[PDB]
Nucleic acid binder design. Structure first.
Lengths: 112, 86, 87
DNA sequence: CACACCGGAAGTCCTAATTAGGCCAT
DNA sequence: GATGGCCTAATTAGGACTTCCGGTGT
């Protein structure tokens, strides 16, 4: 009954002192930073049996969120992203083609 | 159980005129559909052409690629091809 | 419940979410193309398929007798015209 | 030169939709 | 021949990320 999703992961790993050396906040609007990336993703991989995970990878996941509007990137602030809107996000007829004016069947012979 | 349900088959020429022609049919319907959905689902140009052993040439083509099969030009290009020796 | 919503029923209409769309075009482009194969293979018929991504590229499949459709000069020419025709 | 980032493409994973083989009818 | 359909069992995708990276910026 997992259903684990990155952004969420970074709210279990971003609400526990344990990994305050790799992942920590910044500001209070939700912003944060990945001090020790490779390990954060090291944690990630364990989760979702991805033993070959890493930042060059985990990064991309985040990068999509950019457009999926869940986490953007702060110009400069290396290793510093932020959750778009915080703290709100806390919560705690088969033949259709034949009749499409695109289809067309016939015969080779009829091609004169 | 009544019917064996979809049976797995060697992905190689079906050597049974009956089974083959029947397959070519069913699969021709699906792939056509697919083309139609691919194009309508993603507004992308798409052109499929399928020639039956019996000689029936079936074809799907989006607006911009229609000239591929309705133009006298391409119409003849298809002729040229499907008539080349085995 | 499960670890993922599994496959979700989609609306048979153009998708606006550029990502969702680009994705589906990938997954689907991968498959129809697989289909073009198995059919032509299983039945031994000539088959030609051609998909053009809204980004520009033109993925395609063809059986021997049809290669020219996309190989020959008369063909490639026609394909360009078509794809370049006004919207 | 290094290193984060950017993104395109296409490929897992899990599931829940969709196809497609045997067979009989049209 | 070419399909329609049933009964089931194979294959596809949708979503949500993963994998390869070749370009940038700084």
């Amino acid at each position: 009954d997992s259903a684990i999703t990155l952004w969420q992961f970074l709210l279990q790993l971003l609400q526990k002192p344990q990994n305050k050396h790799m992942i920590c906040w910044t500001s209070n609007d939700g912003q944060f930073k990945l001090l020790q990336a490779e390990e954060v993703a090291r944690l990630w991989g364990i989760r979702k049996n991805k033993p070959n995970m890493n930042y060059d990878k985990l990064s991309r996941a985040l990068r999509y969120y950019y457009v999926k509007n869940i986490i953007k990137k702060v110009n400069g602030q290396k290793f510093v992203y932020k959750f778009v809107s915080y703290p709100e996000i806390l919560n705690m007829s088969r033949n259709d083609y034949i009749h499409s004016g695109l289809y067309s069947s016939f015969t080779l012979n009829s091609l004169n | 159980k009544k019917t064996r349900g979809r049976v797995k088959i060697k992905m190689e020429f079906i050597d049974n005129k009956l089974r083959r022609y029947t397959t070519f049919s069913k699969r021709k319907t699906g792939i056509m559909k697919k083309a139609y959905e691919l194009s309508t689902l993603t507004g992308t140009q798409v052109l499929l052409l399928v020639a039956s052993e019996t000689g029936h040439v079936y074809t799907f083509a989006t607006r911009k690629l229609q000239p591929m099969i309705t133009s006298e030009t391409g119409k003849a290009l298809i002729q040229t091809c499907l008539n080349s020796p085995d």
